[PDB]
Every structure is written in C-alpha cells, then in structure tokens.
Scaffold this active site. Structure first.
Site, mmCIF file in Angstrom:
data_model
loop_
_atom_site.group_PDB
_atom_site.id
_atom_site.type_symbol
_atom_site.label_atom_id
_atom_site.label_comp_id
_atom_site.label_asym_id
_atom_site.label_seq_id
_atom_site.Cartn_x
_atom_site.Cartn_y
_atom_site.Cartn_z
ATOM 1 N N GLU A 137 20.244 -12.156 10.632
ATOM 2 C CA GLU A 137 21.025 -11.191 11.387
ATOM 3 C C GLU A 137 20.755 -11.408 12.867
ATOM 4 O O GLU A 137 19.624 -11.692 13.262
ATOM 5 C CB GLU A 137 20.648 -9.751 11.001
ATOM 6 C CG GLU A 137 21.384 -8.710 11.836
ATOM 7 C CD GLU A 137 21.422 -7.316 11.245
ATOM 8 O OE1 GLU A 137 20.939 -7.098 10.110
ATOM 9 O OE2 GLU A 137 21.958 -6.430 11.947
ATOM 10 N N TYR A 172 17.872 -8.961 2.245
ATOM 11 C CA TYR A 172 18.784 -7.938 2.729
ATOM 12 C C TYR A 172 19.802 -7.643 1.641
ATOM 13 O O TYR A 172 20.303 -8.560 0.987
ATOM 14 C CB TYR A 172 19.492 -8.470 3.984
ATOM 15 C CG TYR A 172 20.664 -7.636 4.432
ATOM 16 C CD1 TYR A 172 20.469 -6.463 5.145
ATOM 17 C CD2 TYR A 172 21.965 -8.031 4.153
ATOM 18 C CE1 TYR A 172 21.542 -5.691 5.547
ATOM 19 C CE2 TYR A 172 23.041 -7.266 4.544
ATOM 20 C CZ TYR A 172 22.830 -6.103 5.249
ATOM 21 O OH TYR A 172 23.920 -5.347 5.625
ATOM 22 N N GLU A 191 21.296 0.586 2.534
ATOM 23 C CA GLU A 191 21.172 -0.751 3.095
ATOM 24 C C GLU A 191 19.684 -1.022 3.255
ATOM 25 O O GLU A 191 18.975 -0.228 3.878
ATOM 26 C CB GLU A 191 21.865 -0.793 4.453
ATOM 27 C CG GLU A 191 21.912 -2.170 5.098
ATOM 28 C CD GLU A 191 22.620 -2.146 6.437
ATOM 29 O OE1 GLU A 191 22.440 -1.169 7.195
ATOM 30 O OE2 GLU A 191 23.372 -3.101 6.737
ATOM 31 N N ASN A 210 27.124 -8.932 16.989
ATOM 32 C CA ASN A 210 26.355 -8.636 15.782
ATOM 33 C C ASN A 210 26.928 -9.451 14.626
ATOM 34 O O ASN A 210 28.149 -9.519 14.446
ATOM 35 C CB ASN A 210 26.489 -7.137 15.506
ATOM 36 C CG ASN A 210 25.506 -6.592 14.468
ATOM 37 O OD1 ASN A 210 25.757 -5.523 13.927
ATOM 38 N ND2 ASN A 210 24.391 -7.281 14.213
ATOM 39 N N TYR A 225 16.137 -3.775 3.703
ATOM 40 C CA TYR A 225 15.593 -4.967 4.325
ATOM 41 C C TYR A 225 14.133 -5.146 3.934
ATOM 42 O O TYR A 225 13.337 -4.206 4.018
ATOM 43 C CB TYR A 225 15.569 -4.809 5.839
ATOM 44 C CG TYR A 225 16.876 -4.789 6.592
ATOM 45 C CD1 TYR A 225 17.667 -3.647 6.656
ATOM 46 C CD2 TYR A 225 17.262 -5.904 7.333
ATOM 47 C CE1 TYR A 225 18.836 -3.641 7.424
ATOM 48 C CE2 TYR A 225 18.406 -5.907 8.100
ATOM 49 C CZ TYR A 225 19.189 -4.777 8.135
ATOM 50 O OH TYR A 225 20.331 -4.754 8.903
#
Length: 190
Positions: A177, A77, A86, A44, A88
């Site tokens: 990502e 982001y 968080e 990740n 997006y």
C-alpha cells in the site's frame, strides 16, 4: 503483465490492485505468486496477490524486496464481512506507523517478533460493500522485515480474544500500500 486496477487470477493466485486515480503507480503480475509495484509521486493505492476467499488459519509465506520512499505499508491485508472489517498484519512500513495515535488492544508473539494490536475506525469511507463506517484491526510487527511467514491464526485468535471479531472472510493478500509516496517492491507469495 502490468495491468489496470481490478481483480482476478494470475498463475493460480488471486490479485487485487486498486488506486484512487491520481497516477504514478505501475502494478505488474509475474510468474507464480510474484508481483511488483513501482510508484513515483502516487496517490493512494493497494496491490498484491493471495486468495479469494482467505481462510482463518492460512500460513502465508512471502519473500522479496520492499523499498518505499514515504508513506507505505507491506502487510497481510484483507477483509471480512458481517462484520465488515478491514485488517492488516503489518510486516514493514515507510515513514508512517499506521498505529500512530490508535488505541492499543494487546500484544501477540508470532513468527519471530512481538506485534502490537490496535483497533481504529473508518467513518463513511469506501469499502468492499460501498461507503461505510467500519473498524480496522491491526497487528504491527515490532521487527520489520520483507520476507517471512505469517501464521494468520495467531493474529486472528489474539484479535478474537480481545473482542476484535472477524466475520466471513473475503480476500486475503500480501499487499503493498502507498499513500502519496514513491517506491519499488517485488514480492513473491505462497
């Protein structure tokens, strides 16, 4: 101009590059608002350029190429504090739509497409303030693209209308990502 994970400034733009330590990612900063990511059987990671802090009405322009092979996102982001969120605005993705199974919280039309809005929850997960439980807010573009303009106010306002409130802005980037995938991308932000 390929660097280890970290944050800083390059050619006037904030950048953030984070990974989980698995290997297989090369993140590079280029001229102006340009960055590239090349990855092969990664873990990740998240990397890109933008602003620290972000603002609540930034119009973000991006252009380039985005070629994931597997699970990956291309998004505006960032994070807010107090509440910790968080968020997006997903312009494109690979094999996985990040809203799969998530609760749909509305729709918003912006910048040439309808987006579907969702809220999810991360439980005892890493964050900008340490391990925490926090919400994520998503706008997922129906019509995928790798260049365009994102009027963040349209998203942040729609989220607020739906009860998805943001606190004070922390960083705000155009990010590639990946989650255990391969790919290449070259993006220029302004």
């Amino acid at each position: 101009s390929c660097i280890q994970p970290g944050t800083g400034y390059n050619n006037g733009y904030f950048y953030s590059y984070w990974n989980d330590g698995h290997g297989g990612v090369t993140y590079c900063n280029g001229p102006g608002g340009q960055f590239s990511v090349n990855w092969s059987n990664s873990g990740n990671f998240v990397g890109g350029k933008g602003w620290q802090p972000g603002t609540k009405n930034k119009v973000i322009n991006f252009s380039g190429s985005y070629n994931p092979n597997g699970n990956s996102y291309l998004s505006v982001y960032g994070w807010s504090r107090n509440p910790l969120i968080e968020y997006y605005i997903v312009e494109n993705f690979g094999t996985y739509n990040p809203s799969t199974g998530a609760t749909k919280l509305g729709e918003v039309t912006s910048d040439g497409s309808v987006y579907d809005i969702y809220r999810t929850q991360r439980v005892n997960q890493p964050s900008i303030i340490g391990t925490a439980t926090f919400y994520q807010y998503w706008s997922v573009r129906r019509n995928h693209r790798s260049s365009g303009s994102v009027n963040t106010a349209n998203h942040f306002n729609a989220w607020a209308q739906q009860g998805l409130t943001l606190g004070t802005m922390d960083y705000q980037i155009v990010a590639v990502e990946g989650y255990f995938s391969s790919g290449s991308a070259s993006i220029t932000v302004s």
